[PDB]
Every structure is written in C-alpha cells, then in structure tokens.
Design a protein around this ligand. Sequence first.
Ligand SMILES: [Cl-]
Lengths: 159, 159
Amino acid sequence: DPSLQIDIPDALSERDKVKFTVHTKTTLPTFQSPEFSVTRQHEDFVWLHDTLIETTDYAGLIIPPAPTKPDFDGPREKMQKLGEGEGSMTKEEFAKMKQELEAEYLAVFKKTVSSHEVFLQRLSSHPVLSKDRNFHVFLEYDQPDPVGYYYSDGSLKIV
Amino acid sequence: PSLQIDIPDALSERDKVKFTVHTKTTLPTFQSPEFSVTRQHEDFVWLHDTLIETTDYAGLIIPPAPTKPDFDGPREKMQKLGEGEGSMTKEEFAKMKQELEAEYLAVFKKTVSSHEVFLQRLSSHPVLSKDRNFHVFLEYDNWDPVGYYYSDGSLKIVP
Ligand SMILES: [Cl-]
C-alpha cells in the first residue's frame, strides 16, 4: 500500500510521559504534503480511537483497539531501589544491575511504541477509516531551536 | 568477531558530539560480552596520545586521531537563519532549514565515520586491540538525566 505509510521512528519519555514522533508518507491528495511528521501524546491516540468508535457511520466497522497507556512503573521504582543505593554492592554489580534495569526500561519503551504504531498502521490499511478526516487531523495538525541533533544510520533528528 | 566495535549513534548538543561506542565481544577480559559507552572527541584524542607515548608500541603503526568535529559553517548559517524566521515566508524558512540540516548532516556523518574507523583499526590490530587503556576507553563507565530517547531499538539518555 503505497497510499498511506505511517511509522513511529522515535519517541521521548521524560518522567515516564511519552512523546511519540508520528511520521507519515502518503501519495493521497487529501494531505497538504507528501511527507510530514508530528509529535503526539497518548491522549491524542485515545481521542482518535474514541472519535472513530463514536462515529455513527462506522457502526459495526472493525475499529482497531486503542493502544494501552504507557506504564514505566515496574522499571521506574525498581530503578529507585537500586539507583540511589550505590553503597549496597560493588561498583561493578551496581553497574551490571543498572544496565539490565535499563534493558527492562527498553523492553517497555519498545513495546509501547510498537503498540501505538500498530494502531496507526491498521487504520492506514482500512479502506473506510483511512480516509477519516479526524484521522487526517491526527496525522498532520502541526506547530507549537537547533540546540540538539541525534545522528543515526545516516539520518538527522531533532530533540 | 572476538572484539567488534561500532558507533551506532551520536548526539550533538551545542555542536559537542557524544558518541555511542558499541562493543560486541567474546573475550574474557571484559565484564560483559556486549556493552556500550559514551565518549567525546577528547577521549579519542587521549587514547591516540596514550598509544603514541607508550614505549612497548614504539615502532608500531598508530592510526591517526579522528578530526575534531567542526560544525561552525552550518552553525553560523543556522544562527542567521534563526534570526530571519519572522522575515520570510514559512515556506522558504522550511526550505533553508532543510538545506542547512542536510549540510549539518554531511559533517555529522563524516566525523562519525572518522571516529569509527579509528576504533575499528585499533580493534583489528593484533597488538593494539588488547591494550588495557583501549579497554578502559571501550568499557569504563555530570547531572541527572531528564528522560530517555528511543530510536532504532535503542535507549539514549537525555541530559
Ligand atoms: Cl510538556
């Protein structure tokens, strides 16, 4: 489906509130531009799903489930038991334990990014919902400094 | 395959680059088989100088230091563009910010490869690969980190 291609290439979590980058590649004329990105929070996805669910014309349609709210609590307080407890172990078994707790944080971050992304892709596939204008507002409504840049795999990304 | 080094990503805050130095190893010397650290250009310079002034490596081939990352050309163009935002159309501010970002990206790609080739050359060298100062550079680990930045299946700390 060249028509509408959506991905979440990156995300930021500060204090376990997540800001997702929603990147759209489309050939459909409804959109102002062929490629664009916006930053979204979980409430935006909930609004999108609930708006589709409450549309009368989509009664009985297959509406892909909403992504679950991001939850970092399991890793977060595990991190605060260890993190502020250096003197409890060796310098190297503090380091070891700090890495796998961050590995736990990564597992949660990856799955919630995939959870929010799969939702957007399923909408893209749907012949009715993919043309929904509330979906389109979710993809492109935009606009709130070159301080910081992240380089990976030959690509530049802003903070 | 024993000792494998790459720089998967890097972060530039105020044009100071923090490189992700990623190590995949099966050798018993390292506390972990695969691990990653953040290094800055001064750390690479220190390693090169330590090797040069090491007596046991006197006649060896020492790979040149990576060039210091230089973003000045794009940076000043960027600071001017930033000051004329309110002076031009939003469509021509987008165009020029895209061109300066591509210019910034070219410098970023070239200095990341400059730093990575140095590490891989050290890696490949039969003597130098096994120097513990190099091991300190690969394995050794100022504020709290704000949150976590997710991209490419990886976590990066944001300060
Ligand atoms: Cl905020």
